[PDB]
Symmetry: C3
Subunit: 187 residues, 3 copies
Protein backbone atom coordinates (compact mmCIF):
# COMPACT_ATOMS: atom_id res chain seq x y z
CA UNK A 1 0.00 0.00 0.00
CA UNK A 2 2.78 2.46 0.92
CA UNK A 3 4.80 3.68 -2.05
CA UNK A 4 8.59 3.97 -1.84
CA UNK A 5 8.01 7.72 -2.01
CA UNK A 6 5.66 7.50 0.99
CA UNK A 7 8.39 5.66 2.90
CA UNK A 8 11.01 8.23 1.88
CA UNK A 9 9.04 11.21 3.09
CA UNK A 10 8.22 9.37 6.31
CA UNK A 11 11.92 8.93 7.09
CA UNK A 12 11.75 5.17 6.53
CA UNK A 13 14.01 2.93 4.46
CA UNK A 14 13.04 3.31 0.80
CA UNK A 15 14.24 1.93 -2.52
CA UNK A 16 16.18 4.79 -4.11
CA UNK A 17 15.80 3.32 -7.58
CA UNK A 18 12.03 3.12 -7.32
CA UNK A 19 10.59 4.00 -10.75
CA UNK A 20 8.68 7.05 -9.50
CA UNK A 21 11.56 8.50 -7.47
CA UNK A 22 14.04 8.02 -10.33
CA UNK A 23 11.71 9.88 -12.69
CA UNK A 24 11.39 12.69 -10.13
CA UNK A 25 15.17 12.93 -9.78
CA UNK A 26 15.85 13.01 -13.52
CA UNK A 27 13.14 15.63 -13.95
CA UNK A 28 14.58 17.74 -11.11
CA UNK A 29 18.00 17.68 -12.84
CA UNK A 30 16.57 18.74 -16.21
CA UNK A 31 14.61 21.61 -14.68
CA UNK A 32 17.58 22.58 -12.49
CA UNK A 33 19.80 22.92 -15.58
CA UNK A 34 17.24 25.24 -17.18
CA UNK A 35 17.02 27.27 -13.98
CA UNK A 36 20.79 27.65 -13.62
CA UNK A 37 21.08 28.84 -17.23
CA UNK A 38 18.19 31.30 -16.69
CA UNK A 39 19.89 32.80 -13.63
CA UNK A 40 23.37 32.86 -15.21
CA UNK A 41 22.07 34.68 -18.27
CA UNK A 42 19.88 36.96 -16.16
CA UNK A 43 16.53 35.96 -17.68
CA UNK A 44 13.35 37.00 -15.82
CA UNK A 45 11.86 33.54 -16.42
CA UNK A 46 14.27 32.29 -13.75
CA UNK A 47 11.53 32.89 -11.17
CA UNK A 48 8.91 30.87 -13.06
CA UNK A 49 11.35 28.02 -13.43
CA UNK A 50 12.33 28.14 -9.76
CA UNK A 51 8.68 28.15 -8.74
CA UNK A 52 8.21 24.91 -10.63
CA UNK A 53 11.29 23.41 -9.00
CA UNK A 54 10.86 24.28 -5.29
CA UNK A 55 8.03 22.80 -3.24
CA UNK A 56 7.01 26.33 -2.30
CA UNK A 57 8.21 29.80 -1.50
CA UNK A 58 6.25 32.39 0.44
CA UNK A 59 6.72 35.17 -2.13
CA UNK A 60 7.65 33.39 -5.38
CA UNK A 61 10.80 35.52 -5.54
CA UNK A 62 13.45 33.29 -3.94
CA UNK A 63 16.86 34.53 -5.07
CA UNK A 64 19.16 31.57 -5.82
CA UNK A 65 22.58 31.90 -7.47
CA UNK A 66 24.06 29.29 -9.85
CA UNK A 67 24.74 26.42 -9.92
CA UNK A 68 22.00 25.24 -7.55
CA UNK A 69 21.52 21.49 -7.07
CA UNK A 70 18.77 19.53 -5.36
CA UNK A 71 17.44 15.97 -5.36
CA UNK A 72 13.71 16.51 -5.85
CA UNK A 73 13.09 20.20 -5.52
CA UNK A 74 9.54 19.66 -4.30
CA UNK A 75 10.56 18.89 -0.71
CA UNK A 76 12.07 22.35 -0.32
CA UNK A 77 9.87 25.03 1.28
CA UNK A 78 11.18 28.54 1.85
CA UNK A 79 9.74 31.65 3.49
CA UNK A 80 9.84 35.25 2.25
CA UNK A 81 12.98 36.78 0.81
CA UNK A 82 15.01 33.58 0.60
CA UNK A 83 18.58 34.14 -0.60
CA UNK A 84 21.19 31.51 -1.51
CA UNK A 85 24.59 32.45 -2.95
CA UNK A 86 26.74 30.42 -5.42
CA UNK A 87 26.78 26.63 -5.57
CA UNK A 88 24.35 25.59 -2.82
CA UNK A 89 23.23 21.95 -2.68
CA UNK A 90 20.04 20.75 -0.96
CA UNK A 91 19.42 17.01 -0.77
CA UNK A 92 15.70 17.12 -0.04
CA UNK A 93 14.76 13.44 0.22
CA UNK A 94 12.85 14.57 3.34
CA UNK A 95 11.26 17.97 3.99
CA UNK A 96 13.57 20.95 4.10
CA UNK A 97 11.63 23.75 5.75
CA UNK A 98 13.21 27.20 5.75
CA UNK A 99 11.73 30.30 7.41
CA UNK A 100 11.58 33.97 6.37
CA UNK A 101 14.59 36.16 5.61
CA UNK A 102 17.07 33.30 5.50
CA UNK A 103 20.41 33.81 3.81
CA UNK A 104 22.88 31.12 2.57
CA UNK A 105 26.45 32.10 1.65
CA UNK A 106 28.25 30.21 -1.13
CA UNK A 107 28.66 26.44 -1.00
CA UNK A 108 26.16 25.80 1.79
CA UNK A 109 25.01 22.16 1.78
CA UNK A 110 21.83 20.92 3.46
CA UNK A 111 21.55 17.13 3.67
CA UNK A 112 18.43 15.19 4.63
CA UNK A 113 19.68 12.03 2.91
CA UNK A 114 21.64 9.47 4.90
CA UNK A 115 22.58 5.76 4.97
CA UNK A 116 23.05 2.88 7.45
CA UNK A 117 26.55 2.66 8.98
CA UNK A 118 26.68 -1.09 8.31
CA UNK A 119 27.79 -2.23 4.81
CA UNK A 120 25.13 -4.86 4.04
CA UNK A 121 22.24 -2.54 4.87
CA UNK A 122 23.93 0.43 3.18
CA UNK A 123 24.49 -1.64 0.02
CA UNK A 124 20.94 -3.01 -0.08
CA UNK A 125 19.57 -0.42 -2.49
CA UNK A 126 17.63 1.24 0.32
CA UNK A 127 18.41 4.42 2.21
CA UNK A 128 16.57 6.99 4.32
CA UNK A 129 16.46 10.60 5.40
CA UNK A 130 15.62 12.95 8.26
CA UNK A 131 13.95 16.35 7.69
CA UNK A 132 15.71 19.64 8.29
CA UNK A 133 14.06 22.72 9.72
CA UNK A 134 15.49 26.21 9.69
CA UNK A 135 13.80 29.12 11.47
CA UNK A 136 13.46 32.81 10.63
CA UNK A 137 16.32 35.26 10.05
CA UNK A 138 18.98 32.51 9.84
CA UNK A 139 22.32 33.40 8.24
CA UNK A 140 24.24 30.28 7.12
CA UNK A 141 27.89 31.08 6.43
CA UNK A 142 29.99 29.93 3.49
CA UNK A 143 30.74 26.26 3.03
CA UNK A 144 28.66 25.26 6.08
CA UNK A 145 27.11 21.79 6.27
CA UNK A 146 23.70 21.19 7.82
CA UNK A 147 23.30 17.46 8.55
CA UNK A 148 20.08 15.40 8.48
CA UNK A 149 17.57 15.83 11.32
CA UNK A 150 18.98 19.19 12.37
CA UNK A 151 16.79 22.13 13.43
CA UNK A 152 18.13 25.67 13.53
CA UNK A 153 16.33 28.22 15.69
CA UNK A 154 15.36 31.81 14.89
CA UNK A 155 18.07 34.44 14.40
CA UNK A 156 20.85 31.83 14.58
CA UNK A 157 24.08 32.52 12.70
CA UNK A 158 26.21 29.65 11.33
CA UNK A 159 29.87 30.59 10.93
CA UNK A 160 31.53 29.83 7.59
CA UNK A 161 32.85 26.27 7.44
CA UNK A 162 30.73 25.09 10.36
CA UNK A 163 29.63 21.46 10.34
CA UNK A 164 26.25 21.33 12.06
CA UNK A 165 25.48 17.94 13.57
CA UNK A 166 23.03 18.96 16.34
CA UNK A 167 20.12 21.35 16.84
CA UNK A 168 21.00 25.02 17.03
CA UNK A 169 19.07 27.13 19.59
CA UNK A 170 17.56 30.55 18.87
CA UNK A 171 19.88 33.56 18.92
CA UNK A 172 23.33 31.95 18.88
CA UNK A 173 26.36 31.87 16.65
CA UNK A 174 27.76 28.37 16.15
CA UNK A 175 31.11 27.52 14.60
CA UNK A 176 33.58 24.69 14.14
CA UNK A 177 33.48 20.99 13.31
CA UNK A 178 31.37 19.84 15.05
CA UNK A 179 29.65 23.17 15.43
CA UNK A 180 29.42 24.60 18.95
CA UNK A 181 27.92 27.77 20.35
CA UNK A 182 30.57 30.47 20.21
CA UNK A 183 28.35 33.40 21.12
CA UNK A 184 24.91 34.47 22.25
CA UNK A 185 23.09 37.17 20.31
CA UNK A 186 21.34 39.67 22.57
CA UNK A 187 17.93 40.68 21.16
CA UNK B 1 27.44 62.45 -1.44
CA UNK B 2 28.21 58.74 -1.97
CA UNK B 3 26.78 56.16 -4.36
CA UNK B 4 25.87 52.75 -2.94
CA UNK B 5 28.82 51.39 -4.93
CA UNK B 6 31.08 54.00 -3.29
CA UNK B 7 29.93 52.81 0.12
CA UNK B 8 30.37 49.12 -0.80
CA UNK B 9 33.97 49.61 -1.84
CA UNK B 10 34.75 51.60 1.32
CA UNK B 11 33.54 48.83 3.64
CA UNK B 12 30.37 50.66 4.65
CA UNK B 13 26.75 49.49 4.74
CA UNK B 14 25.40 49.63 1.18
CA UNK B 15 22.11 48.73 -0.49
CA UNK B 16 22.89 45.48 -2.34
CA UNK B 17 19.99 45.92 -4.74
CA UNK B 18 21.15 49.34 -5.87
CA UNK B 19 20.47 49.52 -9.63
CA UNK B 20 24.16 49.96 -10.48
CA UNK B 21 25.32 47.03 -8.32
CA UNK B 22 22.53 44.77 -9.63
CA UNK B 23 23.59 45.58 -13.22
CA UNK B 24 27.25 44.86 -12.42
CA UNK B 25 26.40 41.45 -10.89
CA UNK B 26 24.15 40.54 -13.80
CA UNK B 27 26.96 41.44 -16.18
CA UNK B 28 29.57 39.51 -14.21
CA UNK B 29 27.41 36.37 -14.25
CA UNK B 30 26.79 36.62 -17.99
CA UNK B 31 30.51 37.06 -18.72
CA UNK B 32 31.54 34.37 -16.20
CA UNK B 33 29.34 31.90 -18.06
CA UNK B 34 31.11 32.62 -21.37
CA UNK B 35 34.50 32.40 -19.67
CA UNK B 36 33.70 29.03 -18.06
CA UNK B 37 32.49 27.75 -21.44
CA UNK B 38 35.74 28.97 -23.04
CA UNK B 39 37.97 27.27 -20.46
CA UNK B 40 35.91 24.06 -20.46
CA UNK B 41 36.18 23.77 -24.25
CA UNK B 42 39.82 24.86 -24.25
CA UNK B 43 39.45 27.94 -26.47
CA UNK B 44 42.35 30.44 -26.59
CA UNK B 45 39.84 33.28 -26.18
CA UNK B 46 39.42 32.26 -22.53
CA UNK B 47 42.17 34.76 -21.65
CA UNK B 48 40.62 37.67 -23.45
CA UNK B 49 37.29 36.92 -21.73
CA UNK B 50 38.98 36.58 -18.33
CA UNK B 51 40.80 39.89 -18.83
CA UNK B 52 37.42 41.54 -19.32
CA UNK B 53 36.17 39.93 -16.09
CA UNK B 54 38.96 40.42 -13.54
CA UNK B 55 39.99 43.87 -12.29
CA UNK B 56 43.56 43.24 -13.37
CA UNK B 57 46.22 40.61 -13.71
CA UNK B 58 49.94 41.30 -13.99
CA UNK B 59 50.47 39.18 -17.10
CA UNK B 60 47.02 38.80 -18.66
CA UNK B 61 47.45 35.03 -18.43
CA UNK B 62 45.72 34.02 -15.18
CA UNK B 63 44.95 30.29 -15.25
CA UNK B 64 41.50 29.66 -13.77
CA UNK B 65 39.70 26.33 -14.05
CA UNK B 66 35.89 25.93 -14.41
CA UNK B 67 33.47 26.79 -13.01
CA UNK B 68 34.82 30.04 -11.59
CA UNK B 69 32.35 32.32 -9.75
CA UNK B 70 32.60 35.94 -8.60
CA UNK B 71 30.29 38.79 -7.60
CA UNK B 72 31.68 41.69 -9.62
CA UNK B 73 34.96 40.52 -11.10
CA UNK B 74 36.42 44.03 -11.22
CA UNK B 75 37.46 43.97 -7.55
CA UNK B 76 39.78 41.02 -8.13
CA UNK B 77 43.44 41.83 -8.83
CA UNK B 78 46.09 39.16 -9.30
CA UNK B 79 49.85 39.13 -9.76
CA UNK B 80 51.74 37.07 -12.30
CA UNK B 81 51.31 33.35 -12.86
CA UNK B 82 48.03 33.19 -10.97
CA UNK B 83 46.52 29.69 -10.78
CA UNK B 84 43.14 28.53 -9.46
CA UNK B 85 41.90 24.95 -9.83
CA UNK B 86 38.28 23.79 -10.22
CA UNK B 87 35.28 25.56 -8.69
CA UNK B 88 36.82 28.58 -7.01
CA UNK B 89 34.50 31.28 -5.69
CA UNK B 90 35.54 34.85 -4.91
CA UNK B 91 32.97 37.20 -3.41
CA UNK B 92 34.64 40.47 -4.34
CA UNK B 93 32.30 43.15 -2.94
CA UNK B 94 35.52 44.70 -1.62
CA UNK B 95 39.00 44.55 -3.06
CA UNK B 96 40.64 41.15 -3.33
CA UNK B 97 44.39 41.63 -3.86
CA UNK B 98 46.46 38.59 -4.73
CA UNK B 99 50.24 38.66 -5.27
CA UNK B 100 52.55 36.81 -7.68
CA UNK B 101 52.79 33.05 -8.01
CA UNK B 102 49.72 32.27 -5.96
CA UNK B 103 47.94 28.98 -6.51
CA UNK B 104 44.49 27.90 -5.27
CA UNK B 105 43.54 24.22 -5.12
CA UNK B 106 39.95 23.18 -6.00
CA UNK B 107 37.00 24.66 -4.13
CA UNK B 108 38.87 27.57 -2.54
CA UNK B 109 36.45 30.28 -1.38
CA UNK B 110 37.42 33.89 -0.74
CA UNK B 111 34.79 36.06 0.95
CA UNK B 112 34.83 39.84 1.42
CA UNK B 113 31.05 40.02 1.77
CA UNK B 114 29.55 39.92 5.26
CA UNK B 115 26.47 40.89 7.27
CA UNK B 116 25.42 42.42 10.62
CA UNK B 117 25.06 39.90 13.45
CA UNK B 118 21.59 41.13 14.51
CA UNK B 119 18.49 40.29 12.43
CA UNK B 120 16.82 43.68 11.90
CA UNK B 121 19.99 45.23 10.52
CA UNK B 122 20.90 42.07 8.54
CA UNK B 123 17.42 42.03 6.98
CA UNK B 124 17.44 45.74 6.12
CA UNK B 125 18.63 45.44 2.52
CA UNK B 126 22.08 46.66 3.46
CA UNK B 127 25.29 44.69 3.99
CA UNK B 128 29.02 45.36 3.84
CA UNK B 129 32.44 43.92 3.21
CA UNK B 130 36.07 43.87 4.22
CA UNK B 131 38.93 43.51 1.71
CA UNK B 132 41.16 40.47 1.51
CA UNK B 133 44.86 40.62 0.78
CA UNK B 134 47.06 37.71 -0.21
CA UNK B 135 50.83 38.05 -0.59
CA UNK B 136 53.29 36.42 -2.97
CA UNK B 137 53.96 32.69 -3.34
CA UNK B 138 50.86 31.65 -1.39
CA UNK B 139 49.52 28.12 -1.79
CA UNK B 140 45.87 27.82 -0.70
CA UNK B 141 44.86 24.17 -0.23
CA UNK B 142 41.65 22.51 -1.38
CA UNK B 143 38.33 23.62 0.08
CA UNK B 144 39.96 26.31 2.24
CA UNK B 145 37.91 29.34 3.22
CA UNK B 146 39.38 32.85 3.47
CA UNK B 147 37.05 35.09 5.49
CA UNK B 148 36.48 38.87 5.07
CA UNK B 149 39.22 41.27 6.19
CA UNK B 150 41.92 38.60 6.30
CA UNK B 151 45.48 39.19 5.11
CA UNK B 152 47.84 36.36 4.25
CA UNK B 153 51.59 36.92 4.24
CA UNK B 154 54.23 35.91 1.70
CA UNK B 155 55.06 32.22 1.25
CA UNK B 156 52.21 31.14 3.54
CA UNK B 157 50.67 27.71 2.95
CA UNK B 158 47.00 27.07 3.81
CA UNK B 159 46.24 23.38 4.43
CA UNK B 160 43.23 21.86 2.70
CA UNK B 161 40.02 22.34 4.67
CA UNK B 162 41.47 25.28 6.59
CA UNK B 163 39.02 27.95 7.71
CA UNK B 164 41.03 31.18 7.87
CA UNK B 165 39.43 33.62 10.30
CA UNK B 166 42.38 35.90 11.05
CA UNK B 167 45.61 37.21 9.55
CA UNK B 168 48.26 34.69 8.56
CA UNK B 169 51.94 35.74 8.89
CA UNK B 170 54.68 35.17 6.29
CA UNK B 171 56.33 31.78 6.06
CA UNK B 172 53.87 29.65 7.99
CA UNK B 173 51.59 26.71 7.35
CA UNK B 174 48.15 27.05 8.93
CA UNK B 175 45.43 24.42 9.16
CA UNK B 176 42.22 23.55 10.99
CA UNK B 177 39.00 25.36 11.84
CA UNK B 178 39.69 27.99 12.92
CA UNK B 179 43.09 27.87 11.21
CA UNK B 180 46.17 27.92 13.44
CA UNK B 181 49.87 27.95 12.65
CA UNK B 182 51.05 24.34 12.50
CA UNK B 183 54.52 24.83 11.07
CA UNK B 184 57.09 27.51 10.32
CA UNK B 185 58.65 27.42 6.85
CA UNK B 186 62.40 28.10 6.78
CA UNK C 1 65.05 6.89 -19.84
CA UNK C 2 65.71 6.44 -22.40
CA UNK C 3 62.20 7.42 -23.47
CA UNK C 4 60.78 8.41 -20.07
CA UNK C 5 58.43 11.40 -20.31
CA UNK C 6 56.99 13.83 -17.76
CA UNK C 7 53.83 11.72 -17.77
CA UNK C 8 55.86 8.70 -16.62
CA UNK C 9 57.36 10.73 -13.79
CA UNK C 10 53.94 12.07 -12.82
CA UNK C 11 52.48 8.58 -12.53
CA UNK C 12 55.46 7.38 -10.46
CA UNK C 13 54.93 10.12 -7.90
CA UNK C 14 58.09 11.95 -8.97
CA UNK C 15 58.54 15.68 -9.63
CA UNK C 16 57.14 16.43 -13.10
CA UNK C 17 56.69 19.47 -15.32
CA UNK C 18 52.96 20.19 -15.24
CA UNK C 19 53.01 22.17 -18.49
CA UNK C 20 54.62 19.39 -20.49
CA UNK C 21 52.61 19.47 -23.72
CA UNK C 22 51.30 15.92 -23.53
CA UNK C 23 49.96 16.53 -19.99
CA UNK C 24 48.41 19.90 -20.92
CA UNK C 25 46.72 18.22 -23.91
CA UNK C 26 45.43 15.40 -21.66
CA UNK C 27 43.91 17.90 -19.19
CA UNK C 28 42.33 19.87 -22.04
CA UNK C 29 40.79 16.68 -23.41
CA UNK C 30 39.52 15.62 -19.95
CA UNK C 31 37.76 18.99 -19.48
CA UNK C 32 36.17 18.84 -22.91
CA UNK C 33 34.86 15.30 -22.35
CA UNK C 34 33.84 16.12 -18.74
CA UNK C 35 31.67 18.91 -20.11
CA UNK C 36 29.86 16.49 -22.46
CA UNK C 37 29.53 13.94 -19.66
CA UNK C 38 28.00 16.49 -17.26
CA UNK C 39 25.48 17.63 -19.90
CA UNK C 40 24.56 13.99 -20.57
CA UNK C 41 23.86 13.21 -16.92
CA UNK C 42 22.06 16.54 -16.38
CA UNK C 43 19.74 15.87 -19.31
CA UNK C 44 19.26 12.23 -18.34
CA UNK C 45 20.64 10.75 -21.57
CA UNK C 46 21.54 7.04 -21.65
CA UNK C 47 24.83 7.83 -23.42
CA UNK C 48 26.14 9.28 -20.18
CA UNK C 49 27.60 5.83 -19.49
CA UNK C 50 29.31 5.68 -22.88
CA UNK C 51 30.96 9.05 -22.25
CA UNK C 52 31.88 8.24 -18.65
CA UNK C 53 33.53 4.98 -19.79
CA UNK C 54 35.76 7.03 -22.11
CA UNK C 55 36.64 9.43 -19.27
CA UNK C 56 37.48 7.14 -16.33
CA UNK C 57 40.47 4.79 -16.47
CA UNK C 58 38.08 1.95 -15.65
CA UNK C 59 34.97 0.83 -13.85
CA UNK C 60 34.16 -2.78 -12.99
CA UNK C 61 30.63 -2.70 -14.38
CA UNK C 62 30.67 0.23 -16.82
CA UNK C 63 27.72 1.74 -14.95
CA UNK C 64 29.27 4.15 -12.44
CA UNK C 65 26.64 6.62 -11.28
CA UNK C 66 28.16 10.10 -11.14
CA UNK C 67 26.12 13.25 -10.61
CA UNK C 68 26.90 16.67 -12.16
CA UNK C 69 29.11 18.56 -12.28
CA UNK C 70 31.91 16.04 -11.90
CA UNK C 71 35.47 17.40 -12.34
CA UNK C 72 38.76 15.57 -12.86
CA UNK C 73 42.31 16.29 -14.01
CA UNK C 74 42.94 13.38 -16.38
CA UNK C 75 40.10 10.92 -15.87
CA UNK C 76 42.28 8.00 -16.91
CA UNK C 77 43.94 7.64 -13.49
CA UNK C 78 40.58 6.92 -11.83
CA UNK C 79 39.54 3.28 -11.41
CA UNK C 80 36.33 2.32 -9.64
CA UNK C 81 34.76 -1.01 -8.64
CA UNK C 82 31.17 -2.17 -9.05
CA UNK C 83 28.21 0.08 -8.21
CA UNK C 84 30.20 3.29 -7.78
CA UNK C 85 28.11 6.31 -6.80
CA UNK C 86 29.13 9.98 -6.51
CA UNK C 87 26.65 12.71 -5.69
CA UNK C 88 26.72 16.35 -6.90
CA UNK C 89 29.93 18.27 -7.55
CA UNK C 90 32.65 15.75 -6.69
CA UNK C 91 36.21 16.59 -7.72
CA UNK C 92 38.99 14.04 -8.23
CA UNK C 93 42.50 15.37 -8.93
CA UNK C 94 43.98 12.20 -10.38
CA UNK C 95 47.57 13.16 -11.28
CA UNK C 96 48.37 9.80 -9.65
CA UNK C 97 46.25 6.66 -9.45
CA UNK C 98 42.92 6.90 -7.63
CA UNK C 99 41.77 3.36 -6.91
CA UNK C 100 38.28 2.86 -5.49
CA UNK C 101 36.72 -0.50 -4.58
CA UNK C 102 33.20 -1.93 -4.91
CA UNK C 103 30.03 -0.35 -3.56
CA UNK C 104 31.62 2.97 -2.69
CA UNK C 105 29.46 6.05 -2.43
CA UNK C 106 30.53 9.74 -2.29
CA UNK C 107 28.08 12.32 -0.93
CA UNK C 108 27.99 15.80 -2.55
CA UNK C 109 31.16 17.90 -2.75
CA UNK C 110 33.65 15.12 -1.96
CA UNK C 111 37.17 16.07 -3.06
CA UNK C 112 39.94 13.54 -3.61
CA UNK C 113 43.39 15.03 -4.18
CA UNK C 114 46.48 13.17 -5.36
CA UNK C 115 48.16 16.40 -6.53
CA UNK C 116 50.48 18.26 -4.17
CA UNK C 117 53.37 20.76 -4.09
CA UNK C 118 56.69 21.50 -2.32
CA UNK C 119 56.34 23.47 0.91
CA UNK C 120 59.13 25.90 0.00
CA UNK C 121 58.34 28.70 -2.48
CA UNK C 122 61.24 28.38 -4.93
CA UNK C 123 60.65 24.69 -5.59
CA UNK C 124 56.84 25.13 -5.61
CA UNK C 125 57.18 27.92 -8.21
CA UNK C 126 59.59 25.96 -10.39
CA UNK C 127 56.98 24.57 -12.79
CA UNK C 128 57.28 21.13 -11.22
CA UNK C 129 54.90 19.40 -8.83
CA UNK C 130 54.12 15.83 -7.85
CA UNK C 131 51.46 13.46 -6.58
CA UNK C 132 50.76 10.57 -4.20
CA UNK C 133 48.13 7.95 -5.10
CA UNK C 134 44.90 7.38 -3.17
CA UNK C 135 43.36 4.01 -2.43
CA UNK C 136 39.83 3.49 -1.15
CA UNK C 137 38.61 0.02 -0.14
CA UNK C 138 35.23 -1.69 -0.58
CA UNK C 139 31.97 -0.45 0.95
CA UNK C 140 33.31 3.00 1.77
CA UNK C 141 30.84 5.80 2.37
CA UNK C 142 32.46 9.25 2.11
CA UNK C 143 30.27 11.96 3.64
CA UNK C 144 29.35 15.34 2.17
CA UNK C 145 32.16 17.82 1.58
CA UNK C 146 34.82 15.47 2.89
CA UNK C 147 38.43 15.92 1.77
CA UNK C 148 40.75 13.00 1.05
CA UNK C 149 44.38 14.20 0.83
CA UNK C 150 47.21 12.72 -1.28
CA UNK C 151 48.77 9.39 -0.29
CA UNK C 152 45.80 8.34 1.85
CA UNK C 153 44.43 4.80 1.96
CA UNK C 154 40.96 4.12 3.33
CA UNK C 155 40.13 0.60 4.53
CA UNK C 156 37.07 -1.54 3.72
CA UNK C 157 33.77 -0.60 5.35
CA UNK C 158 35.10 2.71 6.62
CA UNK C 159 32.72 5.62 6.83
CA UNK C 160 33.84 9.24 6.63
CA UNK C 161 31.63 11.80 8.34
CA UNK C 162 30.46 14.84 6.38
CA UNK C 163 33.03 17.65 6.54
CA UNK C 164 35.87 15.31 7.54
CA UNK C 165 39.40 16.22 6.41
CA UNK C 166 41.41 13.03 6.00
CA UNK C 167 45.14 13.51 6.31
CA UNK C 168 46.24 9.98 7.30
CA UNK C 169 45.36 6.37 6.44
CA UNK C 170 41.96 5.26 7.71
CA UNK C 171 41.82 1.62 8.89
CA UNK C 172 38.99 -0.75 7.94
CA UNK C 173 35.70 -0.71 9.85
CA UNK C 174 35.82 2.70 11.53
CA UNK C 175 33.75 5.86 11.37
CA UNK C 176 36.05 8.91 11.26
CA UNK C 177 35.18 12.60 11.48
CA UNK C 178 36.62 16.05 12.17
CA UNK C 179 39.59 18.08 10.92
CA UNK C 180 41.90 16.25 11.10
CA UNK C 181 39.82 13.08 10.82
CA UNK C 182 39.82 10.94 13.99
CA UNK C 183 38.09 7.66 14.85
CA UNK C 184 34.56 8.13 16.17
CA UNK C 185 33.71 4.45 16.63
CA UNK C 186 34.08 1.03 15.05
CA UNK C 187 31.63 -0.82 12.83
CA UNK C 188 31.32 -4.59 12.61
CA UNK C 189 29.24 -6.95 10.50
Amino acid sequence: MKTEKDKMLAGEMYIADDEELVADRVEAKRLTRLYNEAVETGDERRFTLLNQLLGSSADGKAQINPDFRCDYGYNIHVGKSFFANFNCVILDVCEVRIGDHCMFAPGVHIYTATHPLHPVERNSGKEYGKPVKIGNNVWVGGGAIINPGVSIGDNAVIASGAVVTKDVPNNVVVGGNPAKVIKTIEE
